[model samples]
Target: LVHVASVEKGRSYEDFQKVYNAIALKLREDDEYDNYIGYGPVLVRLAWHISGTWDKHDNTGGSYGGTYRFKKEFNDPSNAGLQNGFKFLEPIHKEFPWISSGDLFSLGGVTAVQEMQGPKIPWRCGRVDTPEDTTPDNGRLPDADKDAGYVRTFFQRLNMNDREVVALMGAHALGKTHLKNSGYEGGGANNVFTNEFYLNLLNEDWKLEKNDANNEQWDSKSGYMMLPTDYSLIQDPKYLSIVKEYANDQDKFFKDFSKAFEKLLENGITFPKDAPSPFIFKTLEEQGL
Candidate 1:
């Protein structure tokens, strides 16, 4: 089960850059989506959900397959609010017909992060589309209602260690949870990427409350909320150490997240020894657009 890196026919960094620009521009244009939180957060979630299916044991499910285009994967109960991200990319996919589903899906996350004032996630091309039969079944993604031990063990299946899991969870800072989606709510009304998820976790006075969805969530006085899985970071001692580190050092958090995110998206792919280096895309602001 080896998925090799096959760059799209004659497509180079410039081509992917154009795709990134289109996503970034539309992100700017579609200001009304998700109540002005924009498409950034959902795109990141889409990328993660698509990749989160990977099983390191056999490399069965992962971003390499681009199988989320299939109904089974898309309809996974865990993937509930991600359709918005897919719909947002439909036009981009139609225009840039050559890019693979995996590439576009993953690159959309990269563009959103940078456009939203997040880190520069160096993205690589390739990830040829796999067959529908290759799609991994649902239940691979972690459940949000669990505790710290569950969070730790769940991430282990993805081969993620404590720091990586803590860093990746920082993404919670960018988007609010919708009850219809993950049965949780309001972790972040913020669209920009920052260390605030950690900051909020450590600094806020959180109370356990059952939402209308009948799920338990930690609510803060500041109106922010954290799912049980999110609050788990502080509940576990090892996770708490890293949580505090990310909370205080913005620079370290950004660098660690950039690395962890790239690793997560690239899981289960076999890049050639001399494969092209990852492309660091510039934001629309940097390009003077």
Candidate 2:
């Protein structure tokens, strides 16, 4: 079992709570990404993508190494728009230079999900920095242009099951796709944050409008877009049932999201629970009040 360690000196719960407060404040400040939609969603996405690189069998690429800042990993075509997320973290990285890239990125994911009224995700430290060569090859991320069978099969490489896959995709509820960004139009509304994506899925009177720029994604009167993979959830029989479950019950969504997210962050790692519960940080707004 690979026992994850804490930051070099390690932080007491209270001290780390203070770190959480700092991160929360910054997230509140950087609320302009994706057109004022806030850094919360992409931060979560960044964390997911970095950790998602893990292949359980070989234990090669997970969130342990903070290589996402490098050109090779950062320049990934699949990560077209995430440069904004990295830029948002640049100042925070300067402030907390002691924290590993793996730790800070994963912490951003934990903080965003929890502050957004999601579940408490326990995170640990000990992810040491590695050279850029450690960055995994591109195309490790799921292709948005694919189908249900493809989505299911693709995530399996990362050790994700059906329920987990559904939960992770639900995060699409938080951010939108940009034609310039992902070659998809708009799944996310500009500057709004909520579990509204499901409602948009069921309620939007969607039109199949294609933009001259992004010929791939479909846009609608709702001013949003859904990738073929994102749309497939509603079309596929089994995936639809799960989507409906999240649509109807927010609490259930939070619980399922928490479990799936924790597993996603911990992919390829086996740790003794006695080691420590993951870090749960408070958002900046909550800390101020």
Candidate 3:
């Protein structure tokens, strides 16, 4: 269950940087996906979905397994719309065939976040791919219809506390939920990654309504929607406090989110004490992107 990271032979920051550049360049070029929202949101979702399967109880299904490459995990109902993100990364994988599936998937997220002008997520690459047997079965990802209790309990399996859970959910700012994809629709701006999710949760006059999927969601006339789980942040006192904090301070949200996302991706994997420190990748702007 506990997979120790093994660095790919002769690989280092430069090799990963090259992969990062490819992903960033393609993100800039692919400017029309999701109504011009681009690929950043889905890439982050893909990385999270791939890594989200981890269970702290057994360390079974984290990014370390790289099992999303397998059909079973890829075909899970929860992963319906993520194939686009996967296909987008396919050429990058082919170009840098040595990178592990897990590494590629997780790095896609780190790259997307940085390129999209979000936080600088520190990343370390050593996720060696495992077999189909290591792939986790469906039903581990969170549900949209759930409540605060469910949200809190679900993340406990990943050993996340309240603050960590809130920080991770801040990613909802990046993408919308397609009705066909998850029976839930709309969050904040579909393209830009910001603390806008927290701002919307706190500031918007959301009315609870049923979407076309017949799922209960909160909608605003400005075209934002929040899942029951997102609403739970305000319904619960503990989560609400952090939500208010993040809504007021973007830098604090970015700092907390960066640490939590790195932790999420690294769940269930053991890093050697001597392993290289996490890499804070330079954005395309920093590198003349």
TM-score of each: 0.99, 0.90, 0.98
| Residue 158, model 1, lDDT | 91
Off by over 4 Å in 3: none
In model 1, pairs of residues that clash are 54-61
Whole-model Cα lDDT per candidate? 0.92, 0.74, 0.92
lDDT of 2 by residue, 92-205 (tens): 778877777887788778877767766677776667777878788887787888788999888888888877888877788777776687766665553333445566677777
The list of candidate 2 runs beyond 4 A from truth reads 1-7, 190-193, 272-274, 285-288
> How would the candidate models be sorted by lDDT, starting from the highest?
1, 3, 2
Residue 218 of model 3 has an lDDT of 95
RMSD of each candidate? 0.7, 2.3, 0.9
lDDT of 3: 0.92
Which run of 10 residues does model 1 get worst, by summed lDDT?
A: 180-189
lDDT of 3 by residue, 88-112 (tens): 9999999999999999999999999
TM-score (C-alpha) between model 2 and the true structure: 0.90
Candidate 1 local distance difference test against the native: 0.92
- Determine the C-alpha RMSD for candidate 1 after optimal superposition of all C-alphas: 0.7
Which candidate has the top score in lDDT? 1
